[PDB]
């Protein structure tokens, strides 16, 4: 409820990613706003280093589950907000079928009134003319359920889930996600019963923007608990 108090209105968001994929360095900066009451967020991302060396859709999951709308009966299961304002570390491995792997580490926390997601990403073993480095993925993103379970040993949560990116030739590229979150502070956190997060994502372009970029709208809502 203390953490959850921080999210009662519209919250500015800042995202910073420093990326290295097959030795190719890049940076992304994102800004916008989040409304956890309605499970909604709006963000625009820029590759500040020039051309992004991987496809924007492959970065969506990496680029703030604290903005999920948790219904009233499920408030006691919201680990993400309970960890605020000190925040949580979020780590993944993302394994692209027949291609490379991303490893990510992020800290998601308040800095003043701004929720900040600061990420480091390392990608290795990518095929230089595969779907990823060859930019063969459609500019879109499907709806997914991300199943959350408690990890009481790490006093946090975990999740594994499959993302399926559409490829331009009509096939699909699997990206297998394993995720772990752990609180940054020592204060008490909420450890949840099993549930999931239903996310929809809409990608677009700003017709006035000349930099390499992604405009993102998402709606996220928690569900699957009864009593």
Q: What is the CATH number of the domain that holds 127?
A: 2.40.155.10
Alpha-carbon torsion, ordered 97, 102, 224, 172, to 10 deg: -30
Q: Give Cα 87 distance to the centre of its chain.
A: 15
82-114 burial, b at 16+ Cβ within 10 Å, e below that, comes to bbbbebbbbebebbbeebbebebebebbbeeee
- How far is the C-alpha of 34 from the C-alpha of 37, rounded, in Å? 9
- How far is the C-alpha of 32 from the C-alpha of 110, rounded, in Å? 14
> For residue 34, what are the domain limits?
1-227
| Residue 224 DSSP symbol | -
Domain count, the chain: 1
Experimental method: X-ray
- Helix (H, G, I), strand (E, B), or coil: what is residue 23? coil
Q: What is the resolution of this structure in A?
A: 2.1
């Amino acid at each position: 409820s203390k953490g959850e108090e921080l999210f009662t209105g519209v919250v500015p968001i800042l995202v910073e990613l420093d990326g290295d994929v097959n030795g190719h360095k890049f940076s992304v900066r994102g800004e916008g706003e989040g409304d956890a009451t309605n499970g909604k967020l709006t963000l625009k991302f820029i590759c500040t280093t020039g051309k992004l060396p991987v496809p924007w859709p492959t970065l969506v999951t990496t680029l703030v589950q604290c903005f999920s709308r948790y219904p009233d009966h499920m408030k006691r299961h919201d680990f993400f907000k309970s960890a605020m304002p000190e925040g949580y570390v979020q780590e993944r491995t993302i394994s692209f079928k027949d291609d490379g792997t991303y490893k990510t580490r992020a800290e998601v926390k308040f800095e003043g009134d701004t929720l900040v997601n600061r990420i480091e990403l390392k990608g290795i073993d990518f095929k230089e003319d595969g779907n990823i480095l060859g930019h063969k993925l459609e500019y879109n993103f499907n709806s997914x359920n991300v199943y959350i379970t408690a990890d009481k040993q790490k006093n946090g949560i975990k999740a594994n889930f499959k993302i399926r990116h559409n490829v331009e030739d009509g096939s699909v590229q699997l990206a297998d996600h394993y995720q772990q979150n752990t609180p940054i502070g020592d204060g008490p956190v909420l450890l949840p019963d099993n549930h999931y997060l239903s996310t929809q994502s809409v990608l677009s372009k700003d017709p006035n923007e000349k930099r390499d970029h992604m405009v993102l709208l998402e709606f996220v809502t928690a569900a699957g608990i009864t009593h």
